[PDB]
Amino acid sequence: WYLQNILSLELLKLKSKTNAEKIATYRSYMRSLASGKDNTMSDDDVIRNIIKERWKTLEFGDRNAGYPCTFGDYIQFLNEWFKSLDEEGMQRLREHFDRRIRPLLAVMSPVDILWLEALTQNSPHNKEQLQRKIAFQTSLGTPEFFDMSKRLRYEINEDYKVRDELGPELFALWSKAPERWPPERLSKMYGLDFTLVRKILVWHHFKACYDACVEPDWSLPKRLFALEWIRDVRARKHGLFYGKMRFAEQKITFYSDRFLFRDLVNRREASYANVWEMDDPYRFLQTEQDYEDYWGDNYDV
Amino acid sequence: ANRTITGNDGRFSKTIMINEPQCNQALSAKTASELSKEIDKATNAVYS
Amino acid sequence: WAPQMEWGIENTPSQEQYQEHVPDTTDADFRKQRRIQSRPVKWFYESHYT
Amino acid sequence: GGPGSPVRGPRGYTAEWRDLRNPMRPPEFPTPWERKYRQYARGQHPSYDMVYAGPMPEIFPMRRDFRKPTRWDFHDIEKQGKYRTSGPY
Amino acid sequence: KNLNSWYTKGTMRGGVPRIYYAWMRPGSFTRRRFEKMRNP
Amino acid sequence: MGERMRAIIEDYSKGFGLGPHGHSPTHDTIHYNTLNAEGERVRDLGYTD
Amino acid sequence: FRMSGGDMFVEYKVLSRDHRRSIRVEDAIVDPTFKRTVLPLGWLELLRSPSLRLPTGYFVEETVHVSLPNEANAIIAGPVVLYITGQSVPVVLNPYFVPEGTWDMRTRDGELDLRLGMDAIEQCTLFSELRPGGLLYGKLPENPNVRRNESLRATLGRYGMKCDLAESPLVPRPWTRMRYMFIDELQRGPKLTEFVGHNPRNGTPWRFSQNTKYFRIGIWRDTIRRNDMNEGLHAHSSWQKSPQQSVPEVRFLAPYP
Amino acid sequence: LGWTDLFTTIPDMTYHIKEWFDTTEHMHNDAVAWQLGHLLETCFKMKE
Amino acid sequence: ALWYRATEDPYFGTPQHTQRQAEALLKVYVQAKQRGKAIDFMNKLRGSVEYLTGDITITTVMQESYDALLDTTPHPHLLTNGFTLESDAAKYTGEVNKAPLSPLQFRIDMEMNKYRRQQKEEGVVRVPPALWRLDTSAIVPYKVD
Amino acid sequence: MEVYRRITERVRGALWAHHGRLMSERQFHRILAFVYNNKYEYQIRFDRMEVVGREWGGRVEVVTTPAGFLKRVRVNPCVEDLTLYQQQQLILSAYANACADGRKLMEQAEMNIYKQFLKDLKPIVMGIRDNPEFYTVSENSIETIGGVLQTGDSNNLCHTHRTIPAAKARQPADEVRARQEWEQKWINSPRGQSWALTLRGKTYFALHGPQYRPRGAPGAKKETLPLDIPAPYTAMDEKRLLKKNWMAYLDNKHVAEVMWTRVKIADREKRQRLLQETGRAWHRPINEEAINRW
Amino acid sequence: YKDRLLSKQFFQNPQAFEVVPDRHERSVQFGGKWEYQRTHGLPTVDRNE
Amino acid sequence: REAFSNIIAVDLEQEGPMYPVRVNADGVRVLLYPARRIVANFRVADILCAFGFQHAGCRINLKATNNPKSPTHTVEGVFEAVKALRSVSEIAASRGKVPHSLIYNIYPYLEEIRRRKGMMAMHPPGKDGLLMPDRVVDNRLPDHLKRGYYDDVYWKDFFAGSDEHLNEPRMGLRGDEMRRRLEEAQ
Amino acid sequence: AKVYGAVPPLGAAQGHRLLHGKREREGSLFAVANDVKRDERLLRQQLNALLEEERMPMQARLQRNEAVSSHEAVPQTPLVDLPGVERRRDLPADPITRLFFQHKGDHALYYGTYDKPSVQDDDRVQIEKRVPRRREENLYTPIYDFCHRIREATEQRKRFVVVPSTIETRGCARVMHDHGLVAGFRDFHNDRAFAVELKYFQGDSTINVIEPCSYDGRTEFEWSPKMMRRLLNTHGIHNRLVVYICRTADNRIIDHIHAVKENIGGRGLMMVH
Amino acid sequence: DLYPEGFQWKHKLNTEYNQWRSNTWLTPDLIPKEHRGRFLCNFQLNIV
Ligand SMILES: [Mg+2]
Ligand SMILES: [Mg+2]
């Protein structure tokens, strides 16, 4: 079933476009004029819709009757396949799970249980009473309000999309001499705050690495966040605990308004032979205690 | 230290007042080099 | 690395942890939420700096 | 060794005048100091303290923590009895 | 040198859950009114 | 329903840039189209060659 | 790191352990015929900074024959940090300090003929230059394990390389390994973090489910009279009236719902 | 001569600047720009 | 863990991995019927520094044991030496004698998957020339003792 | 930083003012990021060289990288006899004249950067004003709810300029294709054949042939046709936002509007100052009907 | 560059380069537990050029 | 509904009071002080748990036997106390001072102060970034002129159904597409 | 192979002790013993030096660096100046609108004490010293009623308070103004009193509570450094929120934070927050 | 941040957010007007 429906594209036929349709579509795609039909749907989107509804319309049961698969048959293939997984295989799996299932796992509700069982066409214990209960309760809202397909639809901060950060920026440069490319040069690219943009840079580096089929620098998150690293190390040594320091446990000292002046004139008057000296990753460290806190993790160093 | 320059700070505002009523507010070398400190330490402050 | 801390679930013996005697079997302690235990020598397979 | 401890006690130029030398003039034996250190030693190096560190972010999100069956989750009210179960664990 | 450990501070209430903040209070989280310039 | 209707409408229909008096439509002390003074100015003029 | 005449030249920075004292070296050969990196003996006193942890400047100070460069003709001194221009990670040598007589590299005017050995290559990204196809592979000392003149694809072909990267449809393409990247601030917001236990670190994120003894009467009263408010501990359960259940990683700052 | 834009007749202006910037709230440069600007327009520019 | 602790330990540890350690670990992987790890380890070894130095070497014993376990354990896409035929699989396969995979059909499906892939990625496929024919001459079928 | 961000906001704002197009925040910041990195490159290369300032006679010498860093100081033993104060001032003034020379260099460099930046903005800017629908009215013409009123005075003084040929479109692209047509016409001619064997010819081919760049050599390997981003004909960030969430739409259009207003206010301030400098405008409002009577 | 890159990619996983891929699972590594320090990233171009 | 009218909230950034709160409800003297954990009378305790306090500890009326003691008093006391509590941030602003916790935010600022030396500090000579309009530009065209204006750059009939870009929206259209408009009209 | 900072290449003719290795002199047990002891205490001395450089306060370091900076070869004599520039200036105040006149320091002979004040600021009422009418009553202190003045003036939301002027009282004011619990303060060199300007924020005061340490003058509380150190610690988190003021043997009025810094104990005055 | 922004998303109505995330939506009589659609939370009731 999986081979015929999902994997074989060549057997998939699409409704053929008329000539008028071909023209209107072309001229829509090449040059946009406002007020137009917002749909203009890519045959890519269409195709993927047909596939996902092929996953909708898949039902199990006796296959001497209509449907293709025994349930036992399905979980059998599933079991053979799950044992069959490599490292990056089950990595792809767990990513796929974190992206699709996991958020749904957070947004569920009793109101869905019937629908939740309609996926496998399994019959519940209480099915009539759940019919009644869920009917009465879904009565209290819009039908769009209650369907689990649409509950994830909006995401804050639409200016930077995860889809668009998949291609990492200027990867054809900082690949080739990663030392000449401190986090600053790239951080001018994003209109976000500091913690967020450094976070994003880490993700860029990792995506890039996995893309080029080489292993990523795991010391990179420690390098970009170095100040946060050392603050956490010294906090862990101070309050005795293992974890990451959170806000409640910060010192209650109140600095004066001008407290930063000394450091301000020290920074404003600094000077550097080259730009590498300006931002090297290790300028955070002076005493030996600094070097002992920064590398305590690698028993190599 | 000389009580030549004095100040008044509100939450978000800062007042630097030159006090030398005797010589008609004529700044000495020390007092001027001092004012260029109080002015930029008041001006580079966080809340001003 | 996290130092080992006393008065944990797998640390504390029965009578302090529960006021009852609970049998110590190396298999399936429901109270301790563990499925099974292979019981190697504690500091042998782990790295020493750890 | 502090303030409770026993006290330590105490025209021309002295012998402590000569050892001193201007940082403007090149010193005695030209020991290759690292610039960063001499910056830090005279107090002119821009500070990076623990005060400048924000939150340490979760970068790679761990795993889903699945519900671990406890003694208070049982489908029969009987299995959590007073004669058997004194608490979830 | 601070012998109370932040590791063990608290009282188990049994079933009673309480919230905690990873960093700041959630209300202070999205700053968009100064970011996207909606202010009087 | 009505309030967010109004919010969307007032936000989409608002003007921007500088007017004949050299200021924003939302500027603090100085105003434009007082008592439909421009509306009437179109009433009596009209647009025709 | 640059190439000329067939070999590498790297700038590096030698440093004491406390990083009090430092020396730059501009063009150093990267040569993997040296088991251990060699410096002029005179630097031993230049790099000695007697800190608190090392009352004498160095942890290790001894005499070795050191006849490899050219009976105790040299001195092993450790540990001196070394920062190479390309690399993010410091490399920590315990070098041979050689006097003038043992070996004298003055070789050209102003030029000290310093080079880097496998002491320091093992610790850098430079090490990946040591494998077949790299730029140091020619200069490895001859072995049974290292074939001198073979073409790269010949060598890797023997190790079992058949086609180009992900060329066969059976192996997934490298860049689909990571498709989605999870950043809380950019999408759906932060998690709602609760705990049952002593602290956030000592407890579980999970509340107790509906099957609890104390929750059953309450949940009952809550199913039957749905509209009025009900007393109980049944509030603390993972299950409740509202369509939004309490389970870990609820995104509560998300616009929808 | 256009050496400066600002002029005022108000007694003890300095106090009023202080107390005005006490009632102000945020540090975002939108806010700062408006607070400073409103101060200037209402007093130091001679509109009325 | 032991293999890491071999170079990590100050007191009992060796500076570089001895050959003894290598062939020992390999022997564990052979004796665990552990395929993936044996392959990856072998390749990692021949990519190490000790290998390039000449210190660790792949011997004939390691080599042939490696091959032994490579034969006798299940391969993901293919039938392996030391896969036992099942008489009763005829219930499904349709035949009692032969092996339940045909390398020819496997190759063909590989070609098909190659085109399906080029389509999934570029949205369009180049039609092969008329002089193009799949070369099946190099394929041999499964032999069974 | 400032001079750039002002112009970029000019572009973004204008882009939404004239046509209904929004620029993606992503894009807006990545322009600036490119300027920044340009400056950074110029810095990288600027530190390989040194500038020498010199004070009295030649007897105080200061060697400093153009960024203002100090590398060497040479001094006559004459100086050693002065005073600590005067020694300090002397060296400090040499350092100053060094920083002067360096800063002259850097400012040429920066002019160069500004030019490259403009050249990179040009397909966008000339993207918005080179369309058959684009227009402007004079800033002194009254605007009323129907449309814009006519400025009365000096019917000679208003001249409408037109950037577009009114007959069939000749786009910049046709001009570049014309340029390479003339390149080939010149090359393939007999006199051009003899010229391609000169030093001038091979300088031309080394700089401006990309086609002959060996595989793996830095730089573009084809000649590129000039980018065409016609503003009213290309949907950019408003269509994606309108499909996804209305709220982000309203916020981004709001940002563009605000930026445009701000730019316009700046232009009014500069105009006012230039008007005051030449004495046509007073220093406080003397005409209040120009404000209060609307 | 293409060869330095090729080699690094190959010693990352060999199973990317096989026409019929065998099981690819991570094993131990010879440099240490921190071996990524001596391995990672992409081959680097000489800085002069 | 009287309890929802009186709802209070608590800033949990600090997770418990950072100073002692000494406050009396009517006749009931209450002390809310910082503790290692939650310590209180069972009822007061799960009231303080209702706020999400980890580190608070609280006592009502010295000795527990002290008058007046009612269930009412026990509740009203702890709620009154909590309602008198000041958050640390609020205290810090109250004195016109910067909290130790919020200083990290200044870091990027302070960072590019340090990094502004050299070219990054440099501005283009001659150019302010403020470019005033001088002339008036209008490229608009009569419809018949733009009918075939973009035929070479793009396809013929470029402006076809475009309502904003044409004074005659229906020109250039083939009959079918003209019919479509009316078709949706009726 | 170009080398920077390494001074003449290959140094100059210096062999190590172990490498050169001249034949070891045989010292009598005397010589050897003495070598061992002098070089042992040489190492001890060095360890001391390093610890002292580690523990040096920043102010000390700055004074040192800028002292060396100005250092000349000859120790030059001070130059004769104007008749004086160095009179401490009088702090500015307005004569016409006043709490009190700012009295010149040039009049320092005219001044009285807190007990027997010289006639000045006649136009203003004079605060009276607060003393007990009978035996059982507490014996009041300028600190006691300083705190209660401020507390009551904070409850009535007043801008200015006239308050008793003694050494530790205006000490307390300077400390409170440091921490920003008080808008400002001034001593006019009026004998009896001086004035404090209160600060309000968000509609209530900046001062929650302000309390004196002792009710009597007959009771004097001494604060151990460990106690003042306990205050700073809220179950493992450093708390400077509350301020405690105290006298030192050195007659300084300090908060508990500076006291803990230099590890000195002091006598308690008041708490405020 | 004394007066934080809080929850700013208008994609649903206040009453729809309230409905989904809060049990308080089920008891409209027990809540005053100022808090009506304003709560996203579940409340426990304890009768003393
Ligand atoms: Mg300092
Ligand atoms: Mg009683």
Side-chain angles (χ1 to χ4, degrees), chain G residues 227 232 242 252-255 257, chain N residues 9 12 17 21 26-27 42 44:
Chain G
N227 309 321
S242 49
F252 65 132
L253 287 189
Chain N
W9 308 119
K12 308 158 97 150
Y17 281 117
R21 302 182 188 198
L26 281 161
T27 91
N42 286 285
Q44 173 191 27

Side-chain angles (χ1 to χ4, degrees), chain F residues 16, chain J residues 2-19 21 23 28 31-32 114 117-118 121 124-126 128 134 139 255-271, chain L residues 127-134:
Chain F
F16 63 108
Chain J
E2 200 52 33
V3 182
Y4 301 107
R5 196 175 178 85
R6 277 168 174 174
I7 283 179
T8 320
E9 286 183 15
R10 164 89 34 85
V11 155
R12 192 170 173 189
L15 204 25
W16 168 256
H18 290 287
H19 323 258
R21 314 300 171 191
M23 193 167 63
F28 171 74
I31 295 181
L32 303 192
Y114 182 81
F117 165 69
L118 287 192
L121 273 199
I124 303 180
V125 174
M126 297 215 181
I128 96 180
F134 160 77
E139 285 189 340
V255 161
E257 291 176 350
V258 163
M259 276 184 187
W260 169 254
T261 298
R262 178 181 293 152
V263 153
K264 287 297 289 177
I265 286 160
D267 291 340
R268 175 173 54 83
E269 292 312 302
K270 184 170 185 180
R271 199 124 180 179
Chain L
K127 312 279 181 292
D128 63 340
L130 305 177
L131 300 164
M132 304 169 307
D134 43 351

Side-chain angles (χ1 to χ4, degrees), chain A residues 262 266, chain D residues 43, chain M residues 58 62:
Chain A
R262 269 167 192 87
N266 267 344
Chain M
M58 179 64 88
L62 295 178

Side-chain angles (χ1 to χ4, degrees), chain J:
Chain J
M1 50 142 224
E2 200 52 33
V3 182
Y4 301 107
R5 196 175 178 85
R6 277 168 174 174
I7 283 179
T8 320
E9 286 183 15
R10 164 89 34 85
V11 155
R12 192 170 173 189
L15 204 25
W16 168 256
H18 290 287
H19 323 258
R21 314 300 171 191
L22 295 173
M23 193 167 63
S24 61
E25 286 266 347
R26 161 90 67 179
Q27 179 65 253
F28 171 74
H29 283 295
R30 104 106 66 156
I31 295 181
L32 303 192
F34 267 55
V35 182
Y36 186 89
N37 289 313
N38 221 338
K39 298 171 118 170
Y40 209 87
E41 296 303 313
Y42 268 93
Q43 191 59 268
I44 288 173
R45 292 179 185 52
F46 254 141
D47 294 341
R48 296 284 168 189
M49 53 203 64
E50 64 197 16
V51 173
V52 172
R54 82 192 66 264
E55 224 271 318
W56 148 37
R59 13 275 201 103
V60 186
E61 278 183 13
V62 168
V63 186
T64 285
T65 186
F69 183 72
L70 172 46
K71 310 182 60 56
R72 312 237 332 245
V73 185
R74 291 170 139 201
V75 144
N76 233 210
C78 307
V79 168
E80 210 186 8
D81 295 342
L82 286 178
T83 299
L84 196 268
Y85 186 81
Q86 280 164 335
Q87 280 167 8
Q88 289 192 333
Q89 296 315 302
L90 244 50
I91 301 196
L92 197 72
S93 61
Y95 178 81
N97 289 337
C99 291
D101 285 317
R103 202 261 163 86
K104 173 184 289 67
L105 280 171
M106 290 173 83
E107 86 185 353
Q108 289 172 18
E110 188 70 20
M111 177 50 50
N112 191 1
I113 298 188
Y114 182 81
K115 287 184 183 172
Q116 289 154 16
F117 165 69
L118 287 192
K119 176 150 302 302
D120 189 26
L121 273 199
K122 89 156 286 294
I124 303 180
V125 174
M126 297 215 181
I128 96 180
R129 69 92 93 103
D130 279 346
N131 337 121
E133 53 278 326
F134 160 77
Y135 64 122
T136 305
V137 291
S138 64
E139 285 189 340
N140 58 327
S141 67
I142 303 180
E143 183 178 343
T144 307
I145 61 164
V148 163
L149 260 165
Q150 182 95 9
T151 279
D153 77 314
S154 283
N155 307 322
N156 57 358
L157 251 261
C158 45
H159 296 108
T160 299
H161 293 250
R162 211 183 64 235
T163 312
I164 276 178
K168 181 165 297 299
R170 183 163 189 82
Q171 282 210 347
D174 302 318
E175 295 282 333
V176 170
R177 271 192 305 269
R179 135 165 30 158
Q180 46 216 19
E181 265 306 333
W182 292 320
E183 287 172 349
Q184 275 169 359
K185 195 271 166 67
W186 176 237
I187 286 173
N188 302 323
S189 83
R191 193 186 184 196
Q193 283 306 147
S194 72
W195 164 85
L197 301 184
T198 327
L199 249 77
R200 288 188 85 174
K202 305 216 264 186
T203 301
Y204 173 71
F205 278 139
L207 295 165
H208 293 166
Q211 313 91 20
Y212 307 96
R213 272 175 195 171
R215 187 168 177 176
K221 291 175 180 43
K222 74 179 63 57
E223 184 173 354
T224 56
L225 274 55
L227 183 54
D228 182 45
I229 315 181
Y233 311 138
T234 302
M236 320 194 292
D237 216 31
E238 69 278 7
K239 83 157 170 85
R240 181 180 64 77
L241 286 178
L242 254 185
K243 292 296 297 183
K244 285 321 181 67
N245 71 321
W246 54 276
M247 206 150 169
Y249 179 74
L250 292 192
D251 277 356
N252 279 298
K253 97 173 259 294
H254 175 74
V255 161
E257 291 176 350
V258 163
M259 276 184 187
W260 169 254
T261 298
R262 178 181 293 152
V263 153
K264 287 297 289 177
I265 286 160
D267 291 340
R268 175 173 54 83
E269 292 312 302
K270 184 170 185 180
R271 199 124 180 179
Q272 169 185 321
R273 188 54 200 161
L274 182 143
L275 250 307
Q276 291 185 339
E277 277 183 344
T278 174
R280 295 206 280 284
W282 200 239
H283 66 267
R284 51 166 191 81
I286 67 173
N287 182 13
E288 298 193 340
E289 295 74 351
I291 282 193
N292 294 318
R293 209 162 171 83
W294 308 88

